[PDB]
């Protein structure tokens, strides 16, 4: 009969004894009954499960990085993490402890890393989308006594891949749903548990199945993973992409894929880097390269449509100047430096979740009474930093050349020009003071200087957050000199080489360094 | 057939007229049917239930002290309470009153105390993490299943994360576990799969939680033991004695190539992490060890990797957080208060500026309303004592006063640091520099008194880490000085005060 597959399957002894026992339940009942179909289908499920077929794991780290670098450009910390993983299992057999997790905003490429890690580790790739699952039976299945019963998707994908030790990409943990009568977060805890891997105990397969050799890479957008599951994972947050590495994703990965996708032969469409930088700067904002992929795709479609309805040109050269004819009007814009030194204007720096941008801070004091107004949709910490910097300027006023009764005879207005954008934080502190000093002295602020740093009443410049986006933003906007708190200079080692080589960065301890560098005339 | 197995364990008589009842029913049925699989299963799920074979519980308390101290460093009050429970457990053979509960933030080792208690009492460990016979086949209940798997009559039982058990959804009510916890309803716990009453007495119960958000039928029976946050010397002693070897064995690092110094661990605790427990420290140490393994495979020239306080920027990235230090390099018109929080302690510098003006009073730095009330109270103390401090008393209308605390976008609230702000006001009004080596804490009243505060230990460890030499505490917190480590007492010159005159005598460098 079929004893050669039970014996040749080389199962563990419990699976072997109950499959052989269940065949010795099979061979004295009629094959047209329902029970022979139940135990026959159960034997076939037990035969197609990968009990011992195990794939070979790679051990090289140079070639594994060469595999990881031909699908993705700049996820250097994640690639280093996978090389640490492959470094560790060249000593031990099975890694114990937490599993991998990839948290990021949409479009950063944390689902298309599954094939990259499965190629770099030499392991077979299995993906399971968990975006709307409600019942535990997608993880654990149903009992053998039910009529249309079968294992869950876990055992069915192990049998679908036919090889133990695969790589799993649990696609969306943070999108799972709860329900009565069962919950796949508990069953998924039973999947991810290192002291429950060897005894999984599926409902259809009442044997224990070993899941300790399977690699677990799970993926999410937020930190809304449940606390039974989030404390068994290792969160690697993928941040946004800078403009230069978005340019490199576009040049090296997105442009040939979209030329192949819209079927563009050689020599009928070229796109230089000025057009792509105009897409990143003027037409997209998001963190990720999916919308950049869509704008490249519509450049390719408009190239095709402009080719087969003209039949005279056979080549279209898109650059930064004729991009308006294809994409349209520039939907967004970034801040730039002023071309001449103004008397009440300093360039602050700002950080958002999609990058940074230049702020403008414009003060104007007129002859008046004691009154002082703040406009520009400011938060309480921002305004509170303005009046803190104000009492910095009220002290040391004769040192700065300021008539010290000015607060009882000048009206001071502070305005950031954007109006409808909420702007909060202390990081525009030492810029703010500067503008006040400038409007109280007539000393014009030189327009090459960007400033960041919170201020205290004795004049110290305390650290900030999000420096790299502010330096890339200031380097984008033609700023030459930036001022920084001193103990942010550690973060200067994680800046690219052209930004360090093109900016004149001055570490600053006290407000007198700020007023010595950022003003045109001596104080 | 199976009769020597059912008499081989000597089950109680009720369960053997049940077991012999389905045995004589099994004599009158077909063997190969699935109903006989239910019958043989029901026989099998009673001969695994531990009707006997207890574990001999241990009665001495010195070997229990050291076998508690062999896996956990500094939970001394918890270990005291466990040895007291083993003392009454030594005299009273069956404690069925309340149940031990371990409340504390995540990161401290309240779950592995089930292991240390488990081999400390001598009994067997079954962990329960919370967060009827028929034709299709049924497993027994979870409470009974753990018992059968363990196969012992006296197994320690843990109810982990009852704060995460009772959710806002339809789940388990309080019934099926308080009927386990109560003393009179445990002589007959009829499991629904077996319909046979099984005893639950002489079974130790330990329940762990992260808060007191426990259901009201359960909080009546749970002794709330609190587990405070670990100090930095304790985290160093936990990393060096219990946490580096488990990462070395789960990474297979033999002892010759990797050396993680003490300044490296203190650099991780101070510069790279902020939590109450030692979990994030283990993510940093595990990352450090796997980077050592990667740096041994990718370079066969060097073999020994030395990691210290300097080369933790080559590894682990750059310094994520930072702590406050004493500004000892100069003595100026600001003070150094003390701030308490869940992660630990923090220095809290407080700045004032008093310029000529109309008497405007500006308070700045995301201050809570109780702090602003303490500034107004402290300024009233200064106005009531204006002549004898040497202040021209018209400063309420002739000088504008600004009180700033430097970490903006950090919400700060609390009645403490009132005498600190009074010291800063007397300082900036008199032109008398506050000496920088003095940290301060306390609560000011209009009569000039100093009222007690809370969290004195973390304020003293923050002040000891910051480089402060002299600490001014209230008088009624001398009591809390009975639980400070003596290196911190030996390094800090602690002055308990009771008025503002004792404060201004010490904290100002010139006499007033």
């Amino acid at each position: 009969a079929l004893k050669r597959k039970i014996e040749a399957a080389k199962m563990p002894k419990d699976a072997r004894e109950k499959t052989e026992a269940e065949l010795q339940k099979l061979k004295m009942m009629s094959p047209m009954s329902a029970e022979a179909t139940v135990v026959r289908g159960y034997i076939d499920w037990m035969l197609q499960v990968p009990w011992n077929s195990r794939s070979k794991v790679k051990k090289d780290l140079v070639k594994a990085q060469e595999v990881l670098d031909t699908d993705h450009y700049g996820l250097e910390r994640v690639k280093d993490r996978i090389l640490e993983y492959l470094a560790v299992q060249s000593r031990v057999s099975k890694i114990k402890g937490p599993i991998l997790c990839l948290v990021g905003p949409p479009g950063v490429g944390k689902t298309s890393l599954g094939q990259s890690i499965a190629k770099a580790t030499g392991r077979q790739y299995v993906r399971m989308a968990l975006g709307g699952v409600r019942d535990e039976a997608e993880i654990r299945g149903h009992r053998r006594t039910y009529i249309g019963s079968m294992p869950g998707k876990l055992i069915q994908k192990m049998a679908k891949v036919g090889v133990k030790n695969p790589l799993f990409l649990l696609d969306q943990i943070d999108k799972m749903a709860s329900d009565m009568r069962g919950d796949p977060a508990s069953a998924l805890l039973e999947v991810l548990d290192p002291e429950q891997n060897v005894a999984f105990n599926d409902h259809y397969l009442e044997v224990d199945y070993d899941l300790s050799d399977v690699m677990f890479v799970a993926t999410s957008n937020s930190m809304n993973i449940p606390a039974p599951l989030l404390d068994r994972m290792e969160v690697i947050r993928l941040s946004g992409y800078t403009e230069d590495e978005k340019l490199n994703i576009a040049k090296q990965h997105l442009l040939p894929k979209q030329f192949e996708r819209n079927a563009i032969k050689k020599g009928e469409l070229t796109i230089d880097d000025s057009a792509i930088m105009s897409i990143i700067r003027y037409y997209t904002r998001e963190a990720g390269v999916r919308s950049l992929e869509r704008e490249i795709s519509k450049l390719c479609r408009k190239a095709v449509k402009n080719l087969l309805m003209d039949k005279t040109v056979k080549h279209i050269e898109i650059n930064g100047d004729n991009l308006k004819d294809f994409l349209g009007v520039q939907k967004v814009d970034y801040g730039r430096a002023d071309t001449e030194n103004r008397v009440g204007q300093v360039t602050g720096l700002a950080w958002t979740e999609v990058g940074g941008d230049l702020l403008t801070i414009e003060t104007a004091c007129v002859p008046g009474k004691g009154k002082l107004t703040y406009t520009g949709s400011l938060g309480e910490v921002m305004q509170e930093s303005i009046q803190a910097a104000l009492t910095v300027v009220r002290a040391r006023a004769d040192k700065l050349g300021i008539n010290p009764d000015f607060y009882e005879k000048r009206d001071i207005h502070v305005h950031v020009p954007e109006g409808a954008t909420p702007k909060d934080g202390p990081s525009a502190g030492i810029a703010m003071c500067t503008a006040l000093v400038s409007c109280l002295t007539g000393n014009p602020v030189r327009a090459d200087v960007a400033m960041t740093g919170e201020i205290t009443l004795r004049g110290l410049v305390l650290p900030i957050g999000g420096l790299k986006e502010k330096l890339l933003a200031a380097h984008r906007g033609g700023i030459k000199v930036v001022l920084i708190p001193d103990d942010n200079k550690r973060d200067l080692e994680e800046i690219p080489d052209n930004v360090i080589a093109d900016l004149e960065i001055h570490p600053v301890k006290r407000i007198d360094d700020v007023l010595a560098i950022a003003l045109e005339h001596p104080a | 057939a199976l009769k020597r197995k059912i008499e081989a364990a000597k089950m109680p008589k009720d369960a053997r007229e049940k077991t012999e009842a389905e045995l004589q029913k099994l004599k009158m049925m077909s063997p190969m049917s699935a109903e006989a699989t239910v019958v043989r299963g029901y026989i099998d799920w009673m001969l695994q239930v531990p009707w006997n074979s207890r574990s001999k519980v241990k009665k001495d308390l010195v070997k229990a002290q050291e076998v508690l101290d062999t896996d956990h460093y500094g939970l001394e009050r918890v270990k005291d309470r466990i040895l007291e429970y083993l003392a009454v457990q030594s005299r009273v053979s069956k404690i069925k009153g309340p149940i031990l509960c371990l409340v504390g933030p995540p990161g401290v080792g309240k779950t592995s105390l089930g292991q240390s208690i488990a081999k400390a009492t001598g009994r067997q460990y079954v962990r329960m993490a919370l967060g009827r016979r028929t034709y299709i086949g049924s497993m027994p209940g979870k409470l009974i299943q753990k018992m059968a798997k363990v196969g012992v009559k006296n197994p320690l039982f843990l109810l982990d994360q009852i704060d995460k058990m009772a959710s806002d959804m339809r789940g388990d009510p309080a019934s099926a576990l308080l009927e386990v916890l109560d003393p009179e309803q445990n002589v007959a716990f009829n499991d629904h799969y077996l319909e046979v009453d099984y005893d639950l007495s002489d079974v130790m119960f330990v329940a762990t939680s992260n808060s007191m958000n426990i259901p009201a039928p359960l909080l009546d029976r749970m002794e709330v033991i609190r587990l405070s946050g670990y100090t930095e010397d304790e985290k160093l002693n936990i990393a060096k004695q219990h946490l580096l070897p488990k990462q070395f064995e789960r990474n297979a690092i033999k002892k010759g190539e990797l050396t993680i110094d003490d300044s490296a661990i203190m650099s991780i605790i101070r510069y790279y992490t902020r939590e109450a427990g030692v979990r994030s420290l283990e993510r940093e140490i595990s990352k450090l060890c796997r980077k050592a393994v990667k740096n041994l495979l990718m370079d066969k020239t060097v073999k020994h990797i030395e990691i210290n306080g300097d080369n933790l920027k080559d590894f682990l990235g750059v310094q994520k957080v930072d702590y406050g230090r004493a500004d000892t390099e100069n003595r100026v018109g600001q003070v150094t208060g003390l701030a308490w929080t869940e992660v630990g302690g923090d220095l809290l510098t407080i700045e004032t500026a008093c310029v000529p003006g109309k008497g405007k009073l500006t308070y700045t730095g995301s201050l809570g309303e109780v702090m602003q009330e303490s500034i107004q109270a402290a300024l009233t103390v200064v106005r009531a004592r204006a002549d004898k401090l040497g202040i021209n008393p018209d400063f309420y209308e002739k000088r504008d006063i600004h009180v700033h605390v430097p970490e903006g976008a950090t919400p700060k609230d609390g009645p403490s640091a009132g005498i600190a702000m009074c010291t800063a006001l007397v300082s900036c009004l008199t032109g008398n520099p506050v000496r920088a080596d003095v940290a301060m804490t306390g609560e000011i009243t209009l009569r000039g008194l100093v009222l007690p505060i809370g969290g004195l230990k973390e304020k003293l460890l923050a002040a000891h880490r910051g480089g402060i030499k002299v600490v001014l505490i209230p008088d009624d917190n001398k009591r809390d000085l009975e639980e400070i480590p003596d290196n911190v007492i030996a390094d800090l010159e602690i002055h308990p005060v009771k008025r503002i005159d004792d404060v201004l005598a010490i904290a100002l460098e010139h006499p007033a």
Binding site: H142, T145, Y146, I147, G148, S149 | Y135, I136
Partner: peptide
């Protein structure tokens, strides 16, 4: 015996 999903 047959399973049946209820809402």
């Amino acid at each position: 015996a047959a399973a049946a999903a209820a809402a």
